[PDB]
Amino acid sequence: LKYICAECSSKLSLSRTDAVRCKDCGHRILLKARTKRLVQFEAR
Amino acid sequence: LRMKHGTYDKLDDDGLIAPGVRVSGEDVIIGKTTPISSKRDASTPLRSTENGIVDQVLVTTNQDGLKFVKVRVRTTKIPQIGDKF
Amino acid sequence: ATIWGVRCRPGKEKELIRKLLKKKFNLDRAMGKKKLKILSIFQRDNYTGRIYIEAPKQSVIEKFCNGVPDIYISQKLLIPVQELPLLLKPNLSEVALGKTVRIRSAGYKGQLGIVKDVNGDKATVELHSKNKHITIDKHKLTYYNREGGEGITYDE
Amino acid sequence: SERACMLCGIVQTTNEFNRDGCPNCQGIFEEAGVSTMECTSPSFEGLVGMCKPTKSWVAKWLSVDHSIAGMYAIKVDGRLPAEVVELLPHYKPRDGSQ
RNA sequence: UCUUUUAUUUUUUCUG
Ligand SMILES: [Zn+2]
Ligand SMILES: [Zn+2]
């Protein structure tokens, strides 16, 4: 997964040279999901 | 060309930093190249006096069709002595 | 001799005289026996921003130049008789950098961080829980792959 | 497209020359046997929006007072042909020469 | 064997 939608909240996994339009809907905010990287945070 | 002092390893292949990764000091968050008639980068580094976590990132197209990006960075401010109340 | 110079916007002397003169044929066709007292209108390419009209009275010229856009009728001067022959003379003119790492005997134990700069014998890492850079020797720190998982010491 | 006559200075479209020739110089041009294309030129400066031949003192200087109200250039580059220069002794060059 | 960038002005906001 690379990117996700706003309303449908569906994954796109698109690449460059592609329109930012969503496929399920015309709504195209096109959020980007969290990185695969493991993240450390301490309660301090 | 002229790149910034920020570390470019964090940036993804699309050139945009994903949420959940730290950006600190002058670390770049948006990777920009401004070709004219060699890549001639024109990125926007992070503020030197700011540190935090990239909270959200949004990519859209403006009315002209050009690509628009908005990157929200989150940090926690705990009270210190100099804090005003 | 009644030749008066009038200011107007530069670059359109041709077009302003065109509009004036076309208007004048339209008027002269329209009127009957009485026809308005304008004798000649002209300009010069060398002297831009201005036109020169020869007519007997200021109200005649004003009445004529009503309805013409862009003409600055408010600036007119009566050119003295001596200046006219000269004006009308025919002849003018390392692998540890940028990697994720953990500390294992220090006050900041268990802190993930990212290697930013190394000065030799000591590496600077930004704490992944706090907003600070800290300097600590690399041989004593453990390096991982991009993704969390198998851990290796400083031997890559 | 615009062309300027070299004798009387009347300026107008090359088209309207091709239809009606030179209204002021038609007789002289026919008598000399020269078409208006040669006695007109495209290069001209110093226009005149011309109204009163009999009353314009600018026209008295420029030798237009015997012509019709019209469209006259103070300069029109070129040398007039001899077959009309001889027949109009009172003419003078319009380029400022002579 | 070092160097290496952070436009300008007009406005507004508040801080002491
Ligand atoms: Zn959608
Ligand atoms: Zn003629």
* Number of CB atoms found within 10 A of residue D94's CB: 27
Q: Name the nucleotide with the smallest C1'–CA separation from B42.
A: E5
Tokens of C78: 């009566």
- Could you tell me if A24 and A5 are in contact, meaning their C-beta atoms sit under 8 angstroms apart? yes
How does B31-65 read in b/e, with b if 16+ C-beta sit within 10 Å?
A: beeeeeeeeeeebebbeeeebbbbeebebeeeeee
Q: Which residues in chain C touch residue A44, judged by CB atoms under 8 angstroms apart?
A: 129-130
- Could you tell me if C140 and C105 are in contact, meaning their C-beta atoms sit under 8 angstroms apart? yes
Give the pairing of strands B22-24 and B51-61.
antiparallel
Q: Is residue B26's beta carbon less than 7 angstroms from any atom in nucleic acid strand E?
A: yes
Q: Do C128 and B22 touch (CB under 8 A)?
A: yes
Q: How many Å lie between the centroid of ligand 2 and the Cα of residue A1?
A: 84
D52: alpha, beta or left? (left if phi > 0; alpha if psi -120 to 50): beta
CA of A42 to C1' of E3 (A): 39
* CB burial of residue D65 (10 Å; 0-12, 13-18, 19+): middle
Between CA C42 and CA C14 the distance in angstroms is 9
Phi, psi of D18 (to 5 degrees): -65, -30
Residues 2-21 of A with CB under 8 A from B: 2-3, 16, 20
Q: Is residue B4's beta carbon less than 7 angstroms from any atom in nucleic acid strand E?
A: yes
What is the SS3 assignment for C22? helix
Q: How many helices (H) and strands (E) does chain A have?
A: 0, 0
- C35, C39, C43, C65: which to substitute to probe chain D, counting the most D Cβ within 10 Å? C39
Q: Name the nucleotide with the smallest C1'–CA separation from B47.
A: E6
Reference D5, options C85, C42, D20, C40; nearest CA is D20
Number of structural domains in chain A: 1
Q: Which residues in chain D touch residue C43, judged by CB atoms under 8 angstroms apart?
A: 47
Number of structural domains in chain D: 1
- Could you tell me if C69 and C15 are in contact, meaning their C-beta atoms sit under 8 angstroms apart? no
How does B11-21 read in b/e, with b if 16+ C-beta sit within 10 Å?
A: beebebbbbbb
Q: How was this structure determined?
A: cryo-EM
- Could you tell me if B10 and B23 are in contact, meaning their C-beta atoms sit under 8 angstroms apart? yes
Q: For chain C, percent helix, then strand, then coil, each to nearest 5?
A: 20, 30, 50
Closest CA–CA distance from residue C69 to any residue of chain A (Å)? 49
Q: Which residues in chain B touch residue A37, judged by CB atoms under 8 angstroms apart?
A: 18, 20-21
Q: Is residue B45's beta carbon less than 7 angstroms from any atom in nucleic acid strand E?
A: yes
Question: B76-84, long-range: CB within 8 Å, 24+ apart, which pairs?
Answer: B76/B52
Q: How many Å lie between the centroid of ligand 1 and the Cα of residue B57?
A: 16
Print the domain residue range for A22: 1-44
